[PDB]
Design a protein around this ligand. Structure first.
Ligand SMILES: [Zn+2]
Ligand SMILES: [Zn+2]
Ligand SMILES: [Zn+2]
Lengths: 372, 503
RNA sequence: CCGCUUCACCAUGAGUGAAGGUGGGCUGCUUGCAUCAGCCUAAUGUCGAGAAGUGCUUUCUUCGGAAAGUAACCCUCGAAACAAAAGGAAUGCAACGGAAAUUAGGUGCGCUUGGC
DNA sequence: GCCAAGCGCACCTAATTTCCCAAATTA
DNA sequence: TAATTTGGGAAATT
């Protein structure tokens, strides 16, 4: 069961009294925490024969740490959240490695623990009645206020914000709280691109995934180079190795496509048939890889992985993919591959509904249309 | 004082031995060169067609084989060879990091927890020696490693920052942590015994006998050896350090620079009192062991006047520009080598391997990033040497014109200028600024990192403070020449950093 | 083939002709850039061994947690590259202060809310 | 896919800081 | 003569 953490700014609650109280509880708790990890490490390792169990870490944390941070703060919530915060961070086996030392925080980025009442928003938290101390320590000049019990003098404080924590923002005071929290209709579309090998998209949604050819292009470069140099039989062996790389690459694109669909729940996905993305004339594969590629294996790996995640693959027809508009459907007859080559492969533009973006995602959304 | 500290980073060839064992090594090498004697290298033409040494046989003759080294491990059974030394240094690098961590913790505990925080900057000398030295001396039984660790801790333990909790107790998480080593120098003391037998750079590190552990741990096998105390029963380790490629460097026949510093440390003129040994790069299974000597060299003191005050400012056309209060002589750091570097750091941009998460996956994060990690190591060596070359240039300039104070734009002013060559067309300003500072130091020049006061706009001659030559205006014309309302851009910006008025 | 260089020429270029070329890396003994000799290169790859940790499954409770197991993990350690460890190994130009740590911000990925 | 906001985890990059001692005592 | 050990004593952020 997961923990959703909402963190919203205590802009108002008076004020400066609250800011000063927070600074002080931050510092005071950071002392207990750093000094408790240190006092504890010192007792197991640097004194106690270099051995102790979770038994002793328990005896110490329950006795020394909780009794200190409770006899000071007089607030069960702070002392208990803090007791947990040390227990968490004193990992006895991580330390028996001498793999590293101790997580010792600076008294700023250290969150105040706390453990409620809320209206629409005003948070409301049980806190002790603080009276200022009449004798201020010369050497500890940041601690001004001494707190009282939350049963004997409960002065519960409210905060108008725009397991509970309080902490600085990276001047203003964020308040976190964690809470405990535990589709065959939605249709998706995969279309072979011209700048991205395969771009997949969802109909009536805005979400997409585009497959980068960086890995593919870099490999292709190096392979051509070895060829050029070899042409002044190893070239046969380069062929077999090259095939092994392409085969594993297609598997990795199939995993990435399947993951992008399973994320958005997309339970039916459709993509143009073998002939329709073998002879597309504007496809990445034909205009970069000189129409030499294993299309069959690509579609077969994609469909096998996509059916191994419960998603159903439907094999549609193109119906003027590049040219037709996703959002309305007026063919921009000007948008010939020919038009696109003379330029530097620009975005789409439907002059009828006025919707300009990436012709590959356009094509993707043209596929994903159910009436195909 | 009148001096400046530097390292000399030096590669360990092989552990050196007795005069006996090294005599027999040498004489077998000449024995094989005499045995062997169509083509040759120059040394073996003077003893035909010239070939590169790699291809020569009267060089290739000498390299000794395990047959001899076994005949030697037989003859002289106490002599020291690479295996035992590499095992020892691997142990000492682990034990050192373990000590550095448990010592910072014991120190934190004895100052704040036990003490109750009643500590100033001099009781810290006390606590360091008591806690941290004593711990290291129980382990290593070798004052030099113990005293070396005292210092390597003292460097990272900040008492006022640690009391006001403006940071956390430092902890090292490193495979390759230096072994530090302190022998005292100056007065009746000399530092580490440097020798030069037949012009080779030998350093002798004080060490105690080592006997391999009977019952070795299963979980940490590296802890193999059990050091005697050096005062009790000593076995020193002498290292031969490589000075061959430097003996060819053309700087080896010069009065200033790294080659002359090495010649001085070998001659005995400079003494070393800190060495710091750590591994370089894996060669087979087995590594390159670097030894980083630390010397203090005097100031060069070629005539400079504090009367003449100079300026450095980050310029739009050229990445640094240099000026003098009232001379009219300038310098501009050309942007040619930086451009070659920018083309390269585009190639080394594995954004897919960084982000995909299907790639290089299921062996942990050290291997997920190996490709990227290896390119940043090679790239941050490019930038370093480039920055050094500029600082070299800048220094030469000021020295020519005889400047003694150089004011340079404060780190914030540059890092967030928003019209720097580094911002417009691209960076470490700590490193860039430090490397310039440190070069100038060496000759006598004094840097004072100064405040801007509307630098880019202010008239360098009459004093008018403009708002017309603002970034977007100049950007709009596209970085045009500079003129004033009351009477080059980069030159002006530098020459208003060269204003003694600023603070 | 080029999201390689240069010679150009056309309309910033994943344009067209001509010539060339790892267009990626490893060793050459401190480093960088360029050569050079030899090499690896499916390397933005492929995989091995492991259990410290995030998680997970099973139990146990004195309900904080504890003990087992798995092995998904930006989980842990590791894996290509000169010649025949011990100066066998270059040419040109340029440089050479290193180490440790802290702090900050950011990159990268997952989720809880919302939109384009 | 990006943006905004924050959390959790690990890595990367930049900036800063500090050390690289000296004296006295004991084998 | 070289290696080893010792050195001293509070005070913040908006
Ligand atoms: Zn339309
Ligand atoms: Zn020769
Ligand atoms: Zn003027």
């Amino acid at each position: 069961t997961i923990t959703k953490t909402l963190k919203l700014r205590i802009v108002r609650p008076f004020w400066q009294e609250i800011s000063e109280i927070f600074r002080q509880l931050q510092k005071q708790a950071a002392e207990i925490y750093n000094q408790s990890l240190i006092e504890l490490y010192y007792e197991i390792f640097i004194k106690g024969k270099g051995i102790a169990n979770a038994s002793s870490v328990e005896h110490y944390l329950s006795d020394v740490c909780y009794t200190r941070a409770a006899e000071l703060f007089k607030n069960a919530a702070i002392a208990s959240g803090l007791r947990s915060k040390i227990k968490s961070n004193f990992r006895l086996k991580e330390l028996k490695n001498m793999k590293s030392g101790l997580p010792t925080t600076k008294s700023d980025n250290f969150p105040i623990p706390l453990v409620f009442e809320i209206s629409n928003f005003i948070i409301k938290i049980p806190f002790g009645r603080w009276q200022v101390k009449k004798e201020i320590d010369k050497y500890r000049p940041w601690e001004k206020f001494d707190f009282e019990q939350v049963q004997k003098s409960p002065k519960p404080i409210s905060l108008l914000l725009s397991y509970i924590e309080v902490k600085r923002g990276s001047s203003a005071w964020m308040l976190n709280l964690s809470i405990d929290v535990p589709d065959p209709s939605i249709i998706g579309g995969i279309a072979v691109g011209v700048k991205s090998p395969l771009v997949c998209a969802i109909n009536n949604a805005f979400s997409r995934y585009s497959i980068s050819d960086n890995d593919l292009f870099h490999f292709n470069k190096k392979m051509f180079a070895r060829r050029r140099i070899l042409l002044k039989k190893p070239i046969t062996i380069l062929t077999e190795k090259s095939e092994r790389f392409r085969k594993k690459l297609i598997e990795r694109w199939a995993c990435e496509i399947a993951d992008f669909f399973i994320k958005n729940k997309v339970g039916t996905v459709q993509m143009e048939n073998l002939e329709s993305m073998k002879r597309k004339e504007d496809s990445y594969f034909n205009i970069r890889l000189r129409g030499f590629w294993p299309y069959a294996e690509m579609q077969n790996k994609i469909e096998f992985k996509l059916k191994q995640y419960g998603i159903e693959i439907r094999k549609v027809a193109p119906n003027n993919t590049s040219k037709t508009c996703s959002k309305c459907g007026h063919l921009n007859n000007y948008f010939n591959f020919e038009y696109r080559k003379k330029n530097k492969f620009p975005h789409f533009k439907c002059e009828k509904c006025n919707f300009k973006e990436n012709a590959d995602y356009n094509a993707a959304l043209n596929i994903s249309n159910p009436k195909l | 004082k009148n001096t400046i500290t530097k390292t000399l980073k030096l590669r360990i060839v092989r552990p050196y031995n007795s005069a006996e064992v090294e005599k027999i090594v040498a004489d077998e090498k000449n024995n094989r060169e005499k045995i062997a004697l169509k083509e040759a290298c120059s040394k073996h033409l003077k003893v035909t067609t010239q070939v590169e040494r790699n291809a020569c046989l009267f060089c290739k003759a000498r390299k000794l084989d395990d047959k001899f080294y076994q005949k030697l491990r037989g003859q002289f059974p106490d002599a020291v060879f690479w295996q035992e030394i590499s095992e020892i240094f691997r142990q000492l690098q682990k034990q050192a990091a373990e000590i550095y961590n448990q010592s910072l913790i014991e120190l934190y505990y004895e100052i704040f927890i036990k003490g109750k925080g009643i500590a100033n900057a001099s009781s810290v000398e006390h606590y360091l020696s008591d806690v941290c030295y004593t711990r290291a001396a129980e382990l290593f039984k070798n004052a030099a490693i113990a005293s070396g660790l005292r210092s390597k801790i003292k460097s990272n333990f900040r008492l006022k920052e640690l009391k006001n909790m403006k940071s956390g107790l430092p902890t090292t998480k490193s495979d390759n942590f230096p072994i530090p080593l302190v022998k005292q120098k100056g007065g009746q003391y000399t530092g580490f015994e440097i020798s030069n037998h037949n012009s080779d750079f030998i350093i002798k590190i004080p060490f105690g006998r080592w006997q391999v552990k009977k019952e070795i741990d299963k979980y940490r096998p590296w802890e193999k050896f059990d050091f005697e105390q050096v005062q009790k029963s000593p076995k020193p380790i002498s290292l031969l350090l490589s000075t061959q490629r430097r003996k060819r460097n053309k700087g080896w026949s010069k009065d200033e620079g790294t080659e002359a510093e090495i010649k001085k440390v070998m001659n005995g003129d400079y003494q070393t009192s800190y060495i710091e040994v750590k591994r370089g790069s894996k060669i087979g299974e087995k590594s390159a062991w670097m030894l980083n000597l630390s010397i203090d060299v005097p100031k060069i003191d070629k005539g400079v006047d504090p009367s003449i005050i100079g300026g450095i400012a980050v310029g739009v056309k050229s990445p640094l520009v240099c000026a003098i209060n009232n001379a009219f002589s300038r310098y501009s750091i050309s942007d040619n080598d930086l451009f070659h570097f920018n083309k390269k750091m585009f190639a080394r941009r594995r954004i897919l391997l960084k982000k995909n998460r299907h790639k290089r996956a299921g062996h942990g994060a050290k291997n997920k990033l190996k490709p990227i990690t290896i390119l940043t190591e090679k790239s941050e060596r490019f930038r370093k040497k480039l920055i050094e070359r500029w600082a070299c240039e800048i220094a030469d300039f000021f020295i020519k014109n005889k400047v003694g104070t150089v004011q340079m734009e404060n780190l914030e002013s540059m890092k967030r200028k928003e019209d720097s060559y580094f911002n417009i067309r691209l960076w470490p300003y700590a490193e860039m600024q430090n490397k310039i500072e440190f070069k100038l130091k060496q000759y006598g020049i004094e840097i004072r990192k100064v405040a801007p006061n509307n630098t880019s706009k202010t008239c360098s001659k009459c004093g008018h403070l403009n708002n017309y030559f603002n970034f977007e205006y100049r950007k709009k014309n596209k970085f045009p020449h500079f003129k004033c309302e009351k009477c080059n851009a980069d030159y002006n910006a530098a020459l208003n950093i060269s204003n003694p008025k600023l603070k």
